[PDB]
Design a protein around this ligand. Structure first.
Ligand SMILES: N[C@@H](CCC(=O)N[C@@H](CS)C(=O)NCC(=O)O)C(=O)O
Ligand SMILES: N[C@@H](CCC(=O)N[C@@H](CS)C(=O)NCC(=O)O)C(=O)O
Ligand SMILES: N[C@@H](CCC(=O)N[C@@H](CS)C(=O)NCC(=O)O)C(=O)O
Lengths: 202, 201
C-alpha cells in the first residue's frame, strides 16, 4: 500500500490514519512542483487531477480523495473504531463530517495558500472559514470528538486542516475548544510519528 | 422522511436518489434567504450551516452533506444498486467520485453563482472547471456512468451539477460525452418526476 503524499498537505490525514490503523504502507513523495513521484514517474498517470493524496494498493488499484481513502483505511481494522460500522447511522454521520471538512473547510484554505489569489477572494473565504470554524468549535465544546467520545478519521482529517491555520494567519484562540481538540489529537503517537515522518516536527 | 430543499439547487440530487430508490418522502423547501423552512421554522436550527440539502429520518434524526445523504438513501434499497455494496472496493471508488463532484465541481460552481465575487474570481474557477470537467468527460467517454454500466448516486450528483452549466454559460459542446450523459440521466422517469415535483415544470 503506497501513499502518494506531500509533506504538510492534506495527505497527512490518510497518513495518520495509516499509522493509527497499523497497516503495511510506504510513503511515496510526489513533487507537486514537477508532478513526478519519487521514482520520477509522471504522477498524472496515477492521478490525472495531479493532486494528492492517492492510495495505491499492491495489486495496483488506486483511490483518491482524502475522505474515500481514510474510510478504506479504517475498514481494514474494524477493531480500532476509526469509523462507525458501515450501514450504521454513525457511519453516514462520519461521511457527513468528512465531506464538511473537505468542502466547507479544506477548500476554504486553498485560496489562502495560493499567491495568485486576490485579497478580494482571500478575504471572502476567511470570513466563511470564521463562520465554519465557529460551528466546528461549538461541536467540540459538547464532547471531545466529532462523533462523540470515539475518535474517527474525521477528527484526524479535521486535526490536519486545523494545522494550516497558523500558516495562513488564522487565529484559533477565539475558540478554546478547537485548541483543546488539537492538543488532544496531536497527543496521539500515530499523529506524532506522522509529523516526525513528514519532517514537520523534530 | 423529510428533505429540506430549494428548487434546482444541489438538494435535487438526494431528491432524485429518493425517487430512484422508490422511497417516499416529504419535501420541505427552505428559504435560503431568510433561512426558514416552509413552516417558518428557523432552518439554522436544523442546519447551522444554513444550506440544503438536509435529510431528516422518520426518527427525527437529521443528515447533511449530499454525499452522506445519498449514500444513506442508496443503502436503504440495495436491490436498486444505487451504490456498490459497503465494504466493496467500488463503494470507496463511489465515495471517491462523490467527494470529487462535491469539492472539485460543486464548489467551483458556487462562485459563478455569487455577484459579490471578484470578476477575476470567476475566471480562475472557470478554468478549474474546464480542467476537471475535462477529466469527467474523459471518464464517461468509453463508459455510460462514472462507475461503468450501473448508474449510481454519483451519476445523479454529477447530473444535477452539470445542470448548472447553463445558468453560468459553460457550453458543454467541448464535452459531448457530458451532453450524452446529461441526455441519458435526464430521460429517466425518477429524474423527470423530481423536476416536475420541484416545480421545475
Ligand atoms: N478533493 C481532493 C483535494 C486534494 C488536494 O487539494 N490536494 C492538494 C494538497 S492539500 C494538492 O496536492 N494540490 C495539487 C497541487 O498543489 O499542485 C481531496 O479531498 O483529496
Ligand atoms: N436550478 C438550477 C440549478 C440549481 C442551482 O442553481 N444550484 C446552485 C445554487 S441553488 C449551485 O450551483 N450551488 C453551488 C453552490 O452553492 O456551491 C438550474 O438548473 O437552472
Ligand atoms: N457542502 C454542502 C454544500 C451544500 C450547498 O452549498 N448548498 C447551497 C445550494 S446548492 C446552499 O444552500 N447555499 C446556501 C444559500 O444559497 O443560501 C453539501 O455537500 O451538501
Amino acid at each position: 500500500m503506497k501513499l502518494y503524499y506531500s509533506p504538510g498537505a492534506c495527505s497527512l490525514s490518510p497518513h495518520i490514519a495509516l499509522r493509527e490503523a497499523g497497516l503495511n504502507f510506504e510513503l511515496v513523495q510526489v513533487d507537486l512542483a514537477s508532478k513526478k513521484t519519487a521514482s520520477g514517474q509522471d504522477y498524472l498517470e496515477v492521478n490525472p487531477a495531479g493532486y494528492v493524496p492517492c492510495l495505491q494498493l499492491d495489486d495496483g488499484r488506486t483511490l483518491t480523495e482524502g475522505p474515500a481513502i481514510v474510510q478504506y483505511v479504517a475498514d481494514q481494522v474494524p477493531g480500532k473504531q476509526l469509523a462507525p460500522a458501515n450501514g450504521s447511522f454513525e457511519r453516514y454521520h462520519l461521511q457527513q463530517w468528512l465531506n464538511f471538512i473537505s468542502s466547507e473547510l479544506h477548500k476554504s484554505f486553498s485560496p489562502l495558500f495560493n499567491p495568485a489569489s486576490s485579497d478580494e477572494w482571500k478575504n471572502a473565504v476567511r470570513q466563511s472559514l470564521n463562520t465554519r470554524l465557529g460551528q466546528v468549535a461549538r461541536q467540540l465544546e459538547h464532547a471531545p470528538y466529532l462523533l462523540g467520545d470515539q475518535l474517527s478519521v474525521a477528527d484526524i482529517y479535521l486535526f490536519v486542516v486545523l494545522g494550516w491555520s497558523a500558516y495562513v494567519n488564522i487565529d484559533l484562540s477565539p475558540w478554546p475548544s478547537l485548541q483543546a481538540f488539537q492538543g488532544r489529537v496531536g497527543g496521539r503517537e500515530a499523529v506524532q510519528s506522522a509529523l516526525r515522518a513528514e519532517g514537520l516536527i523534530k
